[PDB]
Every structure is written in structure tokens, then in C-alpha cells.
Amino acid sequence: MQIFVKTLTGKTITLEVEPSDTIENVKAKIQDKEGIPPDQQRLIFAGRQLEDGRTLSDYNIQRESTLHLVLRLRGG
Amino acid sequence: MQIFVKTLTGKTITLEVEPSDTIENVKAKIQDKEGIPPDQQRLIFAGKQLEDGRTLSDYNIQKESTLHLVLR
Amino acid sequence: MQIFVKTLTGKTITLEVEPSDTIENVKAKIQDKEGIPPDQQRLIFAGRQLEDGRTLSDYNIQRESTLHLVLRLRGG
């Protein structure tokens, strides 16, 4: 299935994932589409930050759901 | 000065701050107005997480700037 | 009738008003006599702030009444 990742700066990114994929999995896929390293990504759904390890089905993220993406830059 | 704090769930909050206010000071002001403990607050400006120990002027946050708040 | 709008620095503004005059009208009268814009005016009577939509008679402001003027120094 496909999820929609929208940055708070206005960029929308469509990704290819599956319910068994962890949050660390989608972070590695965003690194492909946009080049953001996984250690500097934070994914938001329902106003809460998503944890590396728990899956998309674990957070009740269904098909065509919207995720939010922020940067975590130390020194930034 | 007056800044705006928006959640991604809908609520918009107005805050009275100073340029020399630190990020943790803004979080304590958010806890006062909202009840959210600063432990679970993440402030966002220009698309990136804001660090504790920095000030609002350090990120060039000025009058009527919009910060975003997400729960950790 | 006459009312007296005094500042916290002793400046007394004598205004010729009517009991049916609204607080906005009083502020516009102050702006004419002195030049203080209305949005910069906080008007106090009997220790409480006066609302724009009310009239003078609404606050039992009779003749020879003394009002107090505090400046709203917050610009934009």
C-alpha cells in the first residue's frame, strides 16, 4: 500500500510500504526519495511522533493516510 | 511579542514571549496554558525540531511567528 | 454634560458628552481634543475598564464624573 508523507514546508511524498513495515523502514525509503538520513527524520501521525520499531498497522495507519515529517538536526 | 503555536490536530494557541525566551521556557508557558507536560512537547519551526537551550531569536522566531507542537 | 478624563500623570481632559454617548464616542472625542488614537485608549471608571459597546449612562456616569485614561502602548 501507499502512504502520503507531507513536510511542514509543503512537500508531499508518496511512498510504497506495507503493514509489516516498521517506522524505521519508511524512514529508509524517504531517504531514497529526498535524501534525508533516517537518524534525522521524525514521522507524525495523529499529532504524535511515531516510534522506530512499531509498524504502520500498529498505529492504525490505513491506506491513503497522511503522515507528517520534520527534521531533527542537532546544531540546527 | 506574540507568536502562534499550532498543533497538527487543529488547535491554535497564542503566546506572549520574548526574543530571549528559551525553548524550554516556551514549553513551560505551553504547559501553563494547555496542561501538556514539557516532557511530551516537541516544538517545530521552519520544518525542523527546536532544541532546548536555544532561544527564539536563535531560530529567528519573531512577531507572529508560527511554531508547531507535536507530542512525543 | 461634562466629564473629566484624567491621566496617571495628572493631565485632565474636560469633555462635553451626553449620557447616551457610547464609549467609542468618548474615545473619538479624546482623539479630537488630544490626538490619542482610540485603540491606544483604555478608559476606567470606578476602577473598572469601560467596554466600547456600552454608553456612559450604562455605567451610571453622571455629570461631573471623573474617568481615568490608561494608554494601550501595544502597537503591532
Author numbering:
A (entry chain B), C (entry chain C): 1 to 76
B (entry chain A): 1 to 72
Please share text taken word for word from the publication where this structure appeared.
Branched Ub chains are formed when two or more sites on a single Ub molecule are modified with Ub, creating distinct bifurcated architectures. Sophisticated mass spectrometry (MS) studies have revealed that a substantial number of K48 and K63 linkages coexist in branched heterotypic chains and these K48–K63-branched Ub chains have been connected to nuclear factor κB (NF-κB) signaling and proteasomal degradation. We engineer a K48–K63 branch-specific nanobody and reveal the molecular basis of its specificity in crystal structures of nanobody-branched Ub chain complexes. The minimal branched Ub chain unit is commonly considered to be made up of three Ub moieties, with two distal Ub moieties linked to a single proximal Ub.
In this K48–K63-branched Ub3 structure, the K48-linked Ub adopts a closed conformation with interactions between the two I44 patches of the distal and proximal moieties, while the K63-linked Ub adopts an open, extended conformation. Previous approaches to generate branched Ub3 used a Ub moiety lacking the C-terminal glycine residues (UbΔC).
